[PDB]
Amino acid sequence: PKVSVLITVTGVDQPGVTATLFEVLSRHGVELLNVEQVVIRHRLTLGVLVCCPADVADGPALRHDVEAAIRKVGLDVSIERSDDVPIIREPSTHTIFVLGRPITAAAFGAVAREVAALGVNIDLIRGVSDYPVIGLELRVSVPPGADGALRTALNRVSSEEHVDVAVEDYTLERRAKRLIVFDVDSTLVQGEVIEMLAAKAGAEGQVAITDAAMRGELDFAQSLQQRVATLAGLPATVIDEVAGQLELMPGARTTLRTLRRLGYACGVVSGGFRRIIEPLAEELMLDYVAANELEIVDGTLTGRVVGPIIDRAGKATALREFAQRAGVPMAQTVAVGDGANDIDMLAAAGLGIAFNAKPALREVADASLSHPYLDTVLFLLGVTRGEIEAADAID
């Protein structure tokens, strides 16, 4: 070992190619510095960086042995002196997830154009899902300070091309997320509990205000007071009744189950009501619940809540509390929500994900998901559909 030689094998994949090459190289004084190999749609690329004697690399024997062995079976090979060549590639700085149903060629084309415009190099592309949504990952190297400009460009691409596009730090630290909190209403659970409760009072219509609150049109606490007031006079029995009518968001069970496989701490933070949520959190085996509480007198709702009120600032406060108890730094926390009520929590989390969200949240969130499948969150956390299905089939 004294001088560096690069060997690159390409062509139609065949069994035994890898073994054959290193067996040939063993007849020469070769030590390995780096090997990279992949097969994509039956196309092989095998790049081998070696050190060998100056004696060996400055002779045609190494070349003839390698070229004869590789060409005979029908692949191409190149061999060249190195010495100035990088031994091992740098890690990517960021990763980009593109989700759609469909993902048009125009959409992906726009992503690639914006990326190229900002001097961002594409290091790798791969599929992460074929169901319930098409999912594609690009690992990239962003020029320093440009990731702000990148997220903006891709958010514009996202709205224009009807796909979800999320840019994430791909560093060792910032991608070992370990704690997640979900908003309940219209995130973990379908629809709005308070609307289901108001329907029992014949007030579903008025409780308008929920859409007003979630878009950020008014103060959460005052909207909460007006809405819960519509429940005044209802028997407390309604609580259990509504609890039993709750449907999980499509993909919710898969989401939680997979997060448990990964060792996540899981919790919920809601402006809804503890008596309806605790029943479900115990079933879903969650680690943390923060919620509001209905006032009850003589087995009847009074139409008020018992303070403290979990408001916008309160949701972030609960996240902080949870993370502190669990020993997880905020940078390694994830929060998932849909309403303006969730703005502070998502902003506080390491990764704030807007799920089918009002515009107010979509605009401050780290990432947005627009398809009615909560398990698309998993793709943003570095999981592939194949990995989910593999682990699920083993139980």
> Which residues share a beta bridge with 74?
none
- How far apart are CB 19 and a second copy at their closest, in Å? 4
Show binding-site residues for Mg(2+): 183, 185, 338
Interface residue with Mg ion among 185, 311, 344, 366 (CB under 5 A) is 185
Q: Which of 319, 34, 44 is nearest to 183 (CA)?
A: 319
Q: Which stretch binds Mg ion (CB under 5 A): 6-14, 67-75, 231-239, 336-344?
A: 336-344
Judged by beta carbon, residue 109 or residue 359, the one nearer a second copy is 109
- How far apart are CB 46 and a second copy at their closest, in Å? 8
Q: Does the footprint of Mg ion cover residue 338 (CB under 5 A)?
A: yes
- How far apart are CB 372 and a second copy at their closest, in Å? 19
Residue 203 near which of Mg ion, a second copy, none (CB within 5-8 Å, type-dependent): none
DSSP at 178 = -
Q: Which of 36, 154, 33 is nearest to 95 (CA)?
A: 154
Q: Does the footprint of Mg ion cover residue 366 (CB under 5 A)?
A: no
- Structural contact between residues 81 and 8, judged by C-beta atoms closer than 8 angstroms: no
In the residue annotation, 58 being an active-site residue is answered as no
Interface residue with Mg ion among 93, 155, 186, 370 (CB under 5 A) is 186
Judged by beta carbon, residue 115 or residue 294, the one nearer a second copy is 115
Cis peptide before 359 (omega within 30 of 0): no
Q: What is the C-alpha separation between 320 and 300, in angstroms, rounded?
A: 34
In the residue annotation, 55 being an active-site residue is answered as no
Residue 385 near which of Mg ion, a second copy, none (CB within 5-8 Å, type-dependent): a second copy
- How far apart are CB 292 and a second copy at their closest, in Å? 28
Which token pair is 256? 């939680």
Residue 6 near which of a second copy, Mg ion, none (CB within 5-8 Å, type-dependent): a second copy
Q: Does the footprint of Mg ion cover residue 137 (CB under 5 A)?
A: no
- How far apart are CB 73 and a second copy at their closest, in Å? 14
Judged by beta carbon, residue 137 or residue 342, the one nearer a second copy is 137
Beta strands 367-369 and 351-355 are: parallel
- Structural contact between residues 39 and 92, judged by C-beta atoms closer than 8 angstroms: no
Judged by beta carbon, residue 198 or residue 381, the one nearer a second copy is 381
Q: Which of 147, 183, 344, 375 is the catalytic position?
A: 183
Q: Does the footprint of Mg ion cover residue 183 (CB under 5 A)?
A: yes
Judged by beta carbon, residue 185 or residue 375, the one nearer Mg ion is 185
Beta strands 179-182 and 333-337 are: parallel
DSSP at 332 = G
Q: Does the footprint of Mg ion cover residue 339 (CB under 5 A)?
A: yes
Residue nearest to Mg ion (CB): 185
- How many other β-carbons are positioned within 10 Å of the β-carbon of residue 128? 21
Residue 122 near which of a second copy, Mg ion, none (CB within 5-8 Å, type-dependent): a second copy
- How far apart are CB 188 and Mg ion at their closest, in Å? 9
Token pair 């992906």 in the structure block, residue: 108
Q: Does the footprint of Mg ion cover residue 168 (CB under 5 A)?
A: no
- CA torsion sign, 261 to 262 to 268 to 274? positive
Q: Which of 134, 117, 116, 118 is nearest to 126 (CA)?
A: 134
Q: What is the C-alpha separation between 225 and 303, in angstroms, rounded?
A: 8
Which token pair is 101? 């149903």
Show binding-site residues for substrate: 192, 227, 270-271, 315, 341
Which token pair is 25? 């190289």
Show binding-site residues: 183, 185, 192, 227, 270-271, 315, 338, 341
Q: Which amino acid is at 350?
A: G
Residue 339 near which of Mg ion, a second copy, none (CB within 5-8 Å, type-dependent): Mg ion
- Structural contact between residues 324 and 316, judged by C-beta atoms closer than 8 angstroms: no
- How many other β-carbons are positioned within 10 Å of the β-carbon of residue 19? 9
Which token pair is 281? 């959190």
Q: Which residues bind Mg ion (CB under 5 A)?
A: 183, 185-186, 338-339
Active site residues: 183, 185
